[PDB]
Amino acid sequence: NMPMTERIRAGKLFTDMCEGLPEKRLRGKTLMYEFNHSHPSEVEKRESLIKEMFATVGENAWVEPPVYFSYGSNIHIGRNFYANFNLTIVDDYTVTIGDNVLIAPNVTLSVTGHPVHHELRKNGEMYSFPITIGNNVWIGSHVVINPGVTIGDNSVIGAGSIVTKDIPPNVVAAGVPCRVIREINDRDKHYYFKDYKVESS
Amino acid sequence: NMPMTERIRAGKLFTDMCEGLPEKRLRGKTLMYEFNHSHPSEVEKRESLIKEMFATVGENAWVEPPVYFSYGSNIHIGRNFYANFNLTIVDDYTVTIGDNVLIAPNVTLSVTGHPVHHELRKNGEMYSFPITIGNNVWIGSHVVINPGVTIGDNSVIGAGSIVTKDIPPNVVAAGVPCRVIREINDRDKHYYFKDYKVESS
Amino acid sequence: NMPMTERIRAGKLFTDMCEGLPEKRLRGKTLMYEFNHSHPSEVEKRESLIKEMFATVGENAWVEPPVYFSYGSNIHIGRNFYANFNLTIVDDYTVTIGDNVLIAPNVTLSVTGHPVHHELRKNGEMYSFPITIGNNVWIGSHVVINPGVTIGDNSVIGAGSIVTKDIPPNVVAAGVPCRVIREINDRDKHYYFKDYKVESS
Ligand SMILES: CC(C)(COP(=O)(O)OP(=O)(O)OC[C@H]1O[C@@H](n2cnc3c(N)ncnc32)[C@H](O)[C@@H]1OP(=O)(O)O)[C@@H](O)C(=O)NCCC(=O)NCCS
Ligand SMILES: CC(C)(COP(=O)(O)OP(=O)(O)OC[C@H]1O[C@@H](n2cnc3c(N)ncnc32)[C@H](O)[C@@H]1OP(=O)(O)O)[C@@H](O)C(=O)NCCC(=O)NCCS
Ligand SMILES: CC(C)(COP(=O)(O)OP(=O)(O)OC[C@H]1O[C@@H](n2cnc3c(N)ncnc32)[C@H](O)[C@@H]1OP(=O)(O)O)[C@@H](O)C(=O)NCCC(=O)NCCS
Ligand SMILES: CC(C)S[C@@H]1O[C@H](CO)[C@H](O)[C@H](O)[C@H]1O
Ligand SMILES: CC(C)S[C@@H]1O[C@H](CO)[C@H](O)[C@H](O)[C@H]1O
Ligand SMILES: CC(C)S[C@@H]1O[C@H](CO)[C@H](O)[C@H](O)[C@H]1O
Ligand SMILES: CC(C)S[C@@H]1O[C@H](CO)[C@H](O)[C@H](O)[C@H]1O
Ligand SMILES: CC(C)S[C@@H]1O[C@H](CO)[C@H](O)[C@H](O)[C@H]1O
Ligand SMILES: CC(C)S[C@@H]1O[C@H](CO)[C@H](O)[C@H](O)[C@H]1O
Numbered sequence: 164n165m166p167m168t169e170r171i172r173a174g175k176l177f178t179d180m181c182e183g184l185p186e187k188r189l190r191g192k193t194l195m196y197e198f199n200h201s202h203p204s205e206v207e208k209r210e211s212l213i214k215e216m217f218a219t220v221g222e223n224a225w226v227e228p229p230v231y232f233s234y235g236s237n238i239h240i241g242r243n244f245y246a247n248f249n250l251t252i253v254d255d256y257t258v259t260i261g262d263n264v265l266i267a268p269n270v271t272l273s274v275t276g277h278p279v280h281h282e283l284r285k286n287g288e289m290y291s292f293p294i295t296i297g298n299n300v301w302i303g304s305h306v307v308i309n310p311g312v313t314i315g316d317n318s319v320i321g322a323g324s325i326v327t328k329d330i331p332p333n334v335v336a337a338g339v340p341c342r343v344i345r346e347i348n349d350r351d352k353h354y355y356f357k358d359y360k361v362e363s364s
Numbered sequence: 365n366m367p368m369t370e371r372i373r374a375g376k377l378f379t380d381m382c383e384g385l386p387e388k389r390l391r392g393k394t395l396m397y398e399f400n401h402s403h404p405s406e407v408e409k410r411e412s413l414i415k416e417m418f419a420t421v422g423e424n425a426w427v428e429p430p431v432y433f434s435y436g437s438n439i440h441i442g443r444n445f446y447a448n449f450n451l452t453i454v455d456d457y458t459v460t461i462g463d464n465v466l467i468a469p470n471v472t473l474s475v476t477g478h479p480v481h482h483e484l485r486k487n488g489e490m491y492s493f494p495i496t497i498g499n500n501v502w503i504g505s506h507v508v509i510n511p512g513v514t515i516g517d518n519s520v521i522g523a524g525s526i527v528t529k530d531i532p533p534n535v536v537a538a539g540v541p542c543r544v545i546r547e548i549n550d551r552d553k554h555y556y557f558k559d560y561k562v563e564s565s
Numbered sequence: 566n567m568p569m570t571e572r573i574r575a576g577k578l579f580t581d582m583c584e585g586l587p588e589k590r591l592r593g594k595t596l597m598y599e600f601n602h603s604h605p606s607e608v609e610k611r612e613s614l615i616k617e618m619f620a621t622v623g624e625n626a627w628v629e630p631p632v633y634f635s636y637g638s639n640i641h642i643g644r645n646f647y648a649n650f651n652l653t654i655v656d657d658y659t660v661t662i663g664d665n666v667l668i669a670p671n672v673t674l675s676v677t678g679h680p681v682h683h684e685l686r687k688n689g690e691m692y693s694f695p696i697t698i699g700n701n702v703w704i705g706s707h708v709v710i711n712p713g714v715t716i717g718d719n720s721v722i723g724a725g726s727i728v729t730k731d732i733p734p735n736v737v738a739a740g741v742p743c744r745v746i747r748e749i750n751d752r753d754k755h756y757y758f759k760d761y762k763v764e765s766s
Contacts, residue, residue, distance in 0.1 A: 164565060174560055192404040200401075200602075203594035231449045231469070245689065248633045248653055251449055251469050265689070268633070268653050268673055271469055271505050278556035279536060279548055281500035281518040285464065287446065290557050299683040304673045304709045305727075307505050307523045310557075317683040322709045323727040323741050325506075325524040335681060339524050339540050339741050347681055355680040356692050356712070359576055364566065365766060375761055393605040401602075432650045432670065452650055452670045472670055472706045472724075479757035480737055480749055482701040482719040486665070488647065491758050508706045508724045511758070526707075526725040540725055540741050 171256055176278065176288040179255065184234075191216070191235040199229040221262070226250065237274075240264075241298070256291035261298035267322065269305045276310045297332060317347065372457055377479065377489040380456065385435075392417070392436040400430035422463065427451065438475075441465075442499065457492035462499035468523065473509045498533060518548065573658055578680065578690045581657065586636075593618075593637045601631040623664065628652065635677075643700070648672070658693035663700035669724065673709045699734060719749065 164170075167184070170177040179185065198212045209228075214220055216235040221242035230250050232238060237254035241262040250266055252258055253273035274291045277284045292311030296302075300314050303322030308314070313329045320326060321337025321344075330336050334343045355361050365371060368385070371378040380386065399413045410429070415421050417436035422443035431451050433439065438455035442463035451467055453459055454474040475492045478485045493512030497503075501515055504523030515521065516533025525542040535544045555561050566572065569586070572579040581587070600614045611630075616622050618637040623644035632652050634640065639656035643664035652668055654660055655675040676693045680686045694713030698704075702716050705724030710716070715731045722728065723739025723746075732738045736745045756762050 174557075176556060176562065189404060196404050203591060203598050247655070249450070249651070253448070253469060263683075263687070265679060265686070267675070268655065269470070269651075269671070273468070273505060276557060277466060277502055278552075278562075279502075279520050280552040280556070281464070281502075281548075282553060283556055283562065284466070284502070287444075287466070290560070292557075299686075301679055301681075301683075301686070304675060305506060305707060309523065319681050321727070322711065323524075323725075325522075339538075347683075351680070351682040352684060355578060355682070355685055356576075356678060356694075359692070361578060361680075361685065377757060377763060390605060397605050450651075454649070454670065470671070474669070474706060477758060478667060478703050479753070479763075480703075480721050481753035481757070482665075482703075482749075483754060484757055484763065485667070485703070486701075488645075488667070491761070493758070506707060510724065524725070526723075 171291055174290060174292060176283065176290055178287055178289070187234050187236065191232065194235060195230060195232065201228065220244070233275075246270075255289065257293035259293065260296045261300065261316070263299045264296055265301045267302060267304040267306070270302050270308075271306070272308045274310050303337075319347070372492055375491060375493060377484065377491055379488055379490070388435050388437065392433065395436060396431065396433065399427075402429065421445075434476075447471075456490065458494040460494065461497045462501065462517070464500045465497055466502040468503060468505040468507070470506050471503055471509075472507070475511050477511045504538075520548070573693050576692065576694060578685065578692055580688055580690060589636050589638065593634065596637055597632065597634060600628075603630065622646070629670075639676075642666075657691065659695040660698075661695065662698045663702065663718070665701045666698055667703045669704060669706040669708070671707050672704050675710070676712050678712045705739075721749070 167177050167182050194216045201208055213224055213226055217238045218236045219239035223242055224244040226246040227248050232252040232254050237256055238252055238258045240260040243263045246266040247268040249269045251271045253275050256274045272294055274294050275289050277289050294308055295313045297314055297316035299317045302320045305323045306320050307325045309327045312326050315330055315332025317333050318330055319335050324337045324341040325339045326341040333347050335345050336343045353360050368378045368383050395417045402410055414427055418439045418441055419437045420440040424443055425441055425445040427447045428449050433453045434455050438457055439453055439459045441461045444464045447467040449469040452472045454476050456476045459475055473495055475495050476490050478490050495509055496514045498515055498517035500518045503521045506524045507521050509527045513527050514530040516531055518534045519531050520536045522538030525538045526540045527542040531537045534548050536546050537544045569579045569584050596618045603611055615628055619640045620638050621641040623642055626646040628648045629650050634654045635657050640654055640660045642662045645665050648668040649670040651671045653673045655677050657677045660676055674696055676696050677691050679691050696710055697715040699716050699718035701719045704722045707725045708722050710728045714728050717732055717734025719735050720732050721737045726739045726743040727741045728743045735749050737747050738745045
């Protein structure tokens with residue numbers, strides 16, 4: 164009701180069957196289908212495919228296929244990135260991942276949400292809001308990060324949580340919905356798992 | 365016990381290694397393997413493949429691969445259906461989806477379940493109860509819909525919820541387990557997301 | 566530090582880019598890639614592939630592709646095993662599954678975890694603790710079993726739960742996080758689902 168890409172940028176409802184958006188996705192799903200079917204030994208092909216797939220990729224990135232996204236060109240990753248099986252990034256808009264981020268299996272990231280009232284989405288209306296994942300963050304298995312969310316630096320996201328609100332840095336958050344359960348302190352510098360202490364050398 | 369398929373229709377426990385069921389499952393996993401490995405540019409092949417896979421398909425359906433099901437023939441879908449990545453439907457029995465239904469990535473629908481008592485499932489005994497999804501329904505990411513569940517028209521299922529009980533129409537529901545959190549009213553006709561209003565034209 | 570494999574067996578922090586671990590993973594993803602890309606009709610190639618993939622496999626095993634794992638060799642499985650779509654086992658160390666175990670679609674098992682304090686994982690430091698799954702257990706859809714977890718015999722794990730603590734045998738557990746909701750008694754020997762009783766013949 165004004166150019167479509169102009170509304171995406173302002174957070175207004177839109178649809179994406181025009182302005183070359185439908186082809187930007189085809190170019191994208193085409194590079195993804197090549198990465199998902201690539202033989203595990205095709206390490207070079209893979210290492211280079213992920214450079215083409217994402218808009219920005221820092222050095223030392225590794226993504227265990229398969230990966231799924233809408234357009235790959237809206238995803239910006241930092242250094243030493245590591246993602247496990249089935250990462251899904253619905254990136255109809257900006258998705259920014261910081262340095263040293265670790266992603267567990269089956270994680271879903273989405274900047275897109277639809278209007279709750281069935282009347283506002285008769286034609287698949289949608290809204291998009293940037294997701295920002297800070298540095299040295301660890302997202303557990305089966306996590307879901309919602310639109311417009313920001314995970315503060317160094318934080319950890321419990322497996323299975325649905326993140327719907329900004330998450331502050333240096334905390335351990337979890338739950339449905341996701342809540343900060345505690346702050347990461349010095350006790351965590353010694354106790355890495357349950358009752359096991361890192362008898363440092 | 366009486367014809368296995370007869371038992372399926374009655375809601376009795378049963379095993380599916382007979383009466384041609386194992387081959388009906390082969391015919392379907394065959395079509396599904398062709399859909400999931402199809403190249404993104406094979407638009408015509410996909411469109412016609414989804415007409416073959418499911419029992420009934422309304423016009424304007426679109427399923428983003430991959431898709432996973434037991435048999436394809438027990439799934440009935442209405443108009444303008446849209447499913448995102450990895451939709452899984454365990455349809456050992458009828459699964460019915462209405463019109464204008466929207467499915468987020470990684471959703472699981474299952475008519476089938478097993479008896480909790482280990483002595484009752486020694487031989488993979490199971491039960492199947494039809495799932496009915498009303499018109500204009502939006503199911504969020506990572507949701508799981510259990511057997512016999514009925515989602516009412518215009519309702520919205522929040523990401524990550526586990527639906528074990530019917531959801532009335534016109535509501536926003538969520539949680540583990542799912543519960544109605546509020547009714548969708550006219551405020552949702554103006555405010556589509558958080559604090560952003562549809563300054564309607 | 567100490568030989569890396571020696572640390573794994575001890576429950577000490579480690580990394581896995583040495584001692585031939587990277588190649589044990591390649592031999593693994595290769596067999597896996599073959600299994601996930603096989604035609605639903607290549608029943609024999611599949612049957613024989615799972616015997617190659619996993620360390621130990623009992624008779625009458627079935628795994629609906631796709632399956633995902635770190636190394637195949639660390640997973641041991643009993644008799645009559647059944648895993649639906651997208652089972653994921655992050656077995657950087659041992660994973661033992663008993664007899665007659667049934668697994669729903671989209672289940673994630675991980676023996677590995679990372680230190681909570683970002684300073685302890687600069688180089689992808691990780692820890693591994695075996696996961697033991699008792700006999701005649703039934704795991705629901707979208708379940709995540711964390712490191713060092715033991716599921717007791719004859720137990721049931723509701724769909725969508727995040728298991729972080731051992732589960733006693735003969736119970737029905739569920740939730741985020743998981744919790745014993747009740748013990749499985751003789752009532753379950755009669756009522757298999759909600760209000761449907763097995764009118765025993
Ligand atoms: C975050 C994590 C590492 C541990 O957090 P922690 O502070 O050291 O754990 P704690 O036991 O002290 O947590 C405290 C409470 O929160 C609960 N909790 C922990 N993780 C939770 C989760 N993901 N969801 C919900 N509740 C959770 C605990 O069960 C515990 O319950 P209680 O208060 O009744 O006793 C672990 O929970 C986790 O989820 N890790 C992700 C593993 C994964 O996905 N790995 C994939 C491969 S990298
Ligand atoms: C349903 C949804 C659109 C928003 O519902 P809403 O009524 O407008 O949201 P509200 O903030 O008013 O919800 C009220 C409360 O419920 C909680 N809540 C919202 N969604 C929840 C969910 N999925 N699970 C659990 N709790 C949830 C909120 O955190 C809030 O907490 P509070 O009571 O402590 O303040 C959003 O939560 C959602 O999950 N969308 C799905 C997105 C998705 O999966 N997209 C994939 C691509 S389409
Ligand atoms: C475990 C299961 C079979 C039923 O357990 P049950 O004891 O017979 O069920 P109940 O209704 O008596 O459960 C009691 C309570 O726990 C809740 N509950 C049940 N399953 C739950 C789950 N997975 N997560 C959270 N809460 C759950 C119920 O909603 C109910 O709520 P209430 O106390 O407010 O009334 C079912 O919940 C389930 O999740 N099955 C898995 C199905 C699946 O994944 N199938 C895939 C193909 S095999
Ligand atoms: C026809 C629409 C549902 S569009 C569809 O919605 C998806 C989320 O549901 C993603 O945002 C896709 O990129 C978008 O094209
Ligand atoms: C190896 C057998 C369990 S048979 C096998 O089971 C599958 C479901 O698990 C499908 O039904 C196949 O069609 C059937 O041949
Ligand atoms: C059936 C049409 C909506 S087209 C379909 O829509 C998808 C997004 O929903 C993708 O853009 C596909 O590339 C496009 O062909
Ligand atoms: C041998 C059985 C576990 S059968 C198996 O159970 C699955 C659910 O667990 C699905 O219902 C399959 O379609 C069914 O064949
Ligand atoms: C790019 C490297 C981290 S290597 C890469 O790491 C993977 C796990 O992340 C697997 O171990 C591969 O087999 C290995 O070659
Ligand atoms: C570089 C590491 C993140 S290693 C990486 O971590 C994964 C879990 O996050 C799995 O354990 C892989 O097998 C392991 O190589």
